[PDB]
Amino acid sequence: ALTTDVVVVGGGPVGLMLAGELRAGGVGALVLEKLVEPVGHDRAGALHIRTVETLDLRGLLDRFLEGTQVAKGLPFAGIFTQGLDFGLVDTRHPYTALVPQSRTEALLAEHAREAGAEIRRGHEVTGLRQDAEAVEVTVAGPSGPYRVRARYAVGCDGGRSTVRRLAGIGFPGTEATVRALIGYVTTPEREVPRRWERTPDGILVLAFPPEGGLGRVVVIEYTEGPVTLEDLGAAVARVRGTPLTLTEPVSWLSRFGDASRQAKRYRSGRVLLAGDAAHVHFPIGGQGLNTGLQDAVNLGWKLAARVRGWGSEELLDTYHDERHPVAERVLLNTRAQLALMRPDEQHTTPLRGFVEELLGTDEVNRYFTGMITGTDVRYATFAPRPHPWAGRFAGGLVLSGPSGEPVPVAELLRSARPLLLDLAGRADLREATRPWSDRVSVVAGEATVEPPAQALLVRPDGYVAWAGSPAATADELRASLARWFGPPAN
Amino acid sequence: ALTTDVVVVGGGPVGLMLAGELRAGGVGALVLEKLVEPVGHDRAGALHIRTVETLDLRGLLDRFLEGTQVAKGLPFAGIFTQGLDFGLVDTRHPYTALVPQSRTEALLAEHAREAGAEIRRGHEVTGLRQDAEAVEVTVAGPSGPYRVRARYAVGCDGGRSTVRRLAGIGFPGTEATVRALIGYVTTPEREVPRRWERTPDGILVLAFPPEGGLGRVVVIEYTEGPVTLEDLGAAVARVRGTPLTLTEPVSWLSRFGDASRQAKRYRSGRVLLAGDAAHVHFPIGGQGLNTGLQDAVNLGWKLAARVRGWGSEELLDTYHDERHPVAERVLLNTRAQLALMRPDEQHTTPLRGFVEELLGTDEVNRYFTGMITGTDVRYATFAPRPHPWAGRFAGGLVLSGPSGEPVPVAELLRSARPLLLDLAGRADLREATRPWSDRVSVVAGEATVEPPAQALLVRPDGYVAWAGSPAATADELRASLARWFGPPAN
Ligand SMILES: Cc1cc2nc3c(=O)[nH]c(=O)nc-3n(C[C@H](O)[C@H](O)[C@H](O)COP(=O)(O)OP(=O)(O)OC[C@H]3O[C@@H](n4cnc5c(N)ncnc54)[C@H](O)[C@@H]3O)c2cc1C
Ligand SMILES: Cc1cc2nc3c(=O)[nH]c(=O)nc-3n(C[C@H](O)[C@H](O)[C@H](O)COP(=O)(O)OP(=O)(O)OC[C@H]3O[C@@H](n4cnc5c(N)ncnc54)[C@H](O)[C@@H]3O)c2cc1C
């Protein structure tokens, strides 16, 4: 309790995002990151719709878009002729932001710092002890071992999570059967076609400048450790069927696989997990970091609330309840996509043909678009029956002010407080909310939503806690307010 | 020309169906079947919606339904929880008729005979010669070799088609990588669960009486010739993971695979191909014989018409044009389903999960239902733009007579003549059709169809040749009649 409120283990993008969220929630956040210096990641990155919407409601979207290429559509499982159609989903931001992870990390690190989080680099957590009041973290640092005492510890320490094992949380799942290499390497060859291809021997992307030079190589072969330029070239030759001249300078080289695992519990007492610490899977569709950043924004406000007292144990438990199912579906969909890309002219090629056809129908395209981009995420939480809007994402709504001015809910959410939106003129609900005004802001505005709602009680993460029609009463809102956001003041 | 009008090579179900069709068309049909006696086939069979509708419009449905079990829905690629929904497609016969092929063969053989086709058993075609006027078939028969002269020869002689090779028609496609066994064998074991199952080692169906005895075994293993009871038992043990006691009496045992081939041309001069002679593929979904019987009904009326003179060369060419694309899609969908059933917990199991979900949506379920049952078949033929009803199946329409009595188009089609249906009161179209009355029947009736049509010119196979709205003229109908059904009489 005495060193800090929350110790965030791991200063990757997820840990950094969480620290920002905890600071926005008015609690102390100490990030302990093992590495002195950041390391290399894929130089191509993707933040999809719901992540973009999430950044917007935290006021980070602008800095993430500056200088950024965006994609207005996406392939699906190596199908490029019927791309995922952002027009078929409801958003104010129909695009994917192609931000390299290194840049996402740098931006979040600066934000955590400006928000007052303490970030210690070269500090490795080596031990973890928990009792009814606090967590103690043991740390190997540049000036020797020391202990940190906190109310909570969150493992944001990646796929090889120290926190997860120390807390005795299971990581059930499958081991890899697919072997991929990725690299940024040089070719002397000119006019190497820039494309993805699928042969009987694997999947290959080559993306080099037409004049030669440093380029992107991804190679995937069906049924961990150092990678050499020779390894990469041999793999490329196997898949492609023709050698490609690859030379120094070599900028980055890595291995990855399709091991698919998920933490059985996202919470064990005063220890929680987020990001790859909580789920790993093959990188297909660019979903891992998106899921993690959203884990962080789900958790941050709830954990700060718990520390401050008005967030209940029940509330904190909804982190696992809400977010475990999401990553579960991500694991499954990445595995499914690997089946859809399997090199095999006999059966899989014909299947891909029908899937491609189906992608040209609005209903199926909408399904896979919602899946990849996160627009289909909604929660079933604290059911009383619930209003249709309960659990839906409201972060992208825009209201009309009394003078006709646009009032984006994304902007209202930047202060990281829950909001009561009065869409219809419900002075009774506005008044009923007064005893919670130390926590919840009330904003009246004109808007029609579908399905209809006269009022929306919105969580700091942009999802709707409670909603009301003309039949809703102040008593019902009082009950929801108490359950979600604690007892009335005074 | 002098022995017979058409020589049908092969007296399997497709050859027998075709002979019936040729007789209905008023031409001679001689079926030459190599085998003296029929042989064994799968004891479980399936005739789907469009086949059922087709039998109806030839007046054979009743005899095919007598004593028959029907299925009101179907699994898809070993998915049983969201079956294909016959309610989502337009038909008067929402079911699959579970007729064993041996019974289909016997029924069609009796019908061909009663219709006046000549059927010779134990007569093997060994040679084929073709000129500008006729085909000569050389035959090894019970009283020695002889020759048959005909206007046309149709190879309905199965996957190993003699006619196809003799005519120099290619059979491009893939060789098998999947090995299946099927058998009717005895077990002494009691209460062997009746079910389909998919394990990491294959696909297996066991269907035995609870008290033991003769039962159905199908086993499929992923990457031709005699099969023993030992072979079957060893395969069952590999897939199931536990041996099953199998003993005599053994009633039937067979091998099959997923070789997928299709005749590059369905017609070469005076030689045509139908049925498995024209296309083979893995038996999944029960589509092979359905496709063949429909091949036969597409061809029969057109070929008889050609023999009689009013059917043009252009008309006969539409057999290939219309039917080749159909079997092409069947080959592809069977290959695709094998991908969907592939034993593989790593990737395919998760994919199957999403496919199962999608099958619970009307749009995707309708798609696969139409695919398997043939309700999605429609033709793009003799485009003039064409009326929306052109090429659609009208065989299941029912009209109201002048006295209110129901007048099924299926019954009207039994005489095997094209029909002009006057749905609105178009005396001008009725009159315009008189010079073709030796070939085409005119029937007035009340009915609203969707999309709207005032008149439908229906082919003997139940598909629409031409349709008209109020703007259609008698001149347009004259032109269509001439193109489809020959010059006006007199
Ligand atoms: C090739 C590739 C391409 C990808 N592309 C995309 C994409 O386009 N879009 C997308 O959303 N996702 C993508 N991903 C997935 C994404 O990179 C991960 O989901 C993301 O790195 C997870 O972030 P994290 O903060 O949870 O974990 P990490 O990035 O692994 O950070 C964990 C941090 O914890 C620190 N740590 C570990 N142990 C300790 C300890 N004991 N004490 C202190 N600190 C510790 C580590 O040093 C590390 O810095 C891709 C992944 C790969 C491999
Ligand atoms: C296990 C299994 C289950 C199946 N289940 C279904 C199902 O449920 N539904 C479905 O629609 N389909 C099913 N099928 C496919 C179906 O059996 C075939 O499509 C069907 O047999 C094709 O009929 P056919 O008349 O074209 O050829 P065949 O049945 O092979 O008949 C060809 C005939 O030609 C004769 N012949 C060959 N050469 C000569 C010659 N030179 N001279 C004279 N005669 C010759 C042969 O003796 C044979 O009798 C299944 C197939 C298998 C293997």
Q: Are residues A341 and A472 in the same domain?
A: no
Tokens read off for B461: 């196979």
Q: Are A164 and A74 in a shared domain?
A: yes
Does the beta carbon of A382 lie under 8 angstroms from any beta carbon of chain B?
Answer: no
DSSP A401: P
Residue A490 marked as a ligand binder? no
Distance (angstroms) between ligand 1 centre and the Cα of A109 equals 14
CA gap B281, B464 in Å, rounded: 29
Distance CA(A422)–CA(A246), nearest Å, equals 62
Of B379, B409, B439, the last residue of a domain is B379
Domain boundary among A257, A272, A295: A257
Q: What is the resolution of this structure in A?
A: 1.9
For residue A238 the two structure tokens come to 């196997």
For an interface test with B, give the residue of A328, A354, A362 to mutate (most B CBs within 10 A): A354
Residues in chain B with CB shorter than 8 Å from the CB of A339 are: 339, 342, 344, 347-348, 350-351
C-alpha A203/C-alpha A216 separation (Å) is 14
**Which residue lies with its CA nearest to atom 15 of ligand 2?**
B288
CA distance B276 to B291: 9
Ligand nearest to the CA of B153: 2
Nearest-atom number in ligand 2 for the CA of B123 is 43
Structural domain range at position A211: 178-257
CB within 8 Å of A73: residues ≥ 6 apart = A83, A84, A85, A86
| Ligand 2 centre distance from Cα of residue B283 (Å) | 11
Q: Check A339 against B358: CB less than 8 A apart.
A: no
In 3-state terms chain B splits into helix, strand, coil percentages (rounded to 5) of 35, 30, 40
- Residues with Cβ within 8 Å of B66's Cβ and at least 6 positions away in sequence, in order, are none
Are A154 and A70 within one domain?
A: yes
CA atoms within 13 A on the CB side of B280: 20
Together in a domain, A422 and A291:
no
What values do phi and psi take at A184, rounded to 5?
-110, 110
Classified as helix, coil or strand, A408 is strand
Give A224 Cα–ligand 1 centroid separation in angstroms. 15
CA atoms within 13 A on the CB side of A75: 13
Identify the CATH number of the domain in which residue B250 sits: 3.30.70.2450
- In the numeric block, the tokens 């103690």 are attached to A136
Q: Tell whether A350 and A415 lie within a shared domain.
A: no
**Together in a domain, A314 and A336:** yes
Which parts of A208-365 are beta strand (E)?
Answer: 213-222, 247-257, 260-262, 267-268, 271-273, 279-280
Q: Are residues A170 and A249 in the same domain?
A: no
- Whether residues A317 and A392 share a domain: the answer is no
Claim to verify: residue B365 and residue B416 sit in the same structural domain: no
Residues 6+ apart with CB under 8 A from B286: B45, B46, B48, B96
Say which CATH number the domain at B448 has.
Answer: 3.40.30.120
Do B156 and B186 belong to one domain?
A: no
A34 CB-side CA count, 13 A:
16
User: Which chain B residues touch A345 with a CB distance below 8 Å?
Assistant: 174
Whether residues B171 and B190 share a domain: the answer is no
Q: Does residue A333 sit at the B interface (CB-CB below 8 Å)?
A: yes
Task: Give the C-alpha distances (Å, rounded to integers) separating A333 from A71, A337, A359, B361.
Answer: 21, 6, 16, 18
Question: Is the distance from CB of A68 to CB of A44 less than 8 angstroms?
Answer: no
Q: Which two tokens stand for residue A192?
A: 């190497």
Domain boundary among A210, A240, A257: A257
Pocket test residue of A21, A30, A42, A337 for ligand 1, highest count of atoms within 8 A of CB: A42
Domain match, B328 and B386 both:
no
Q: Determine whether the interchain pair B339/A348 forms a contact, defined as Cβ–Cβ distance below 8 Å.
A: yes
Instruction: Identify the residue whose tokens are 């926590």.
Output: A439
Could you tell me which of B182, B163, B142 has the C-alpha nearest to residue B6? B163
CATH number, domain of B298, equals 3.50.50.60
> Where chain B is broken, by preceding residue (C–N > 2.5 Å)?
223, 384
Total domains in chain B come to 3
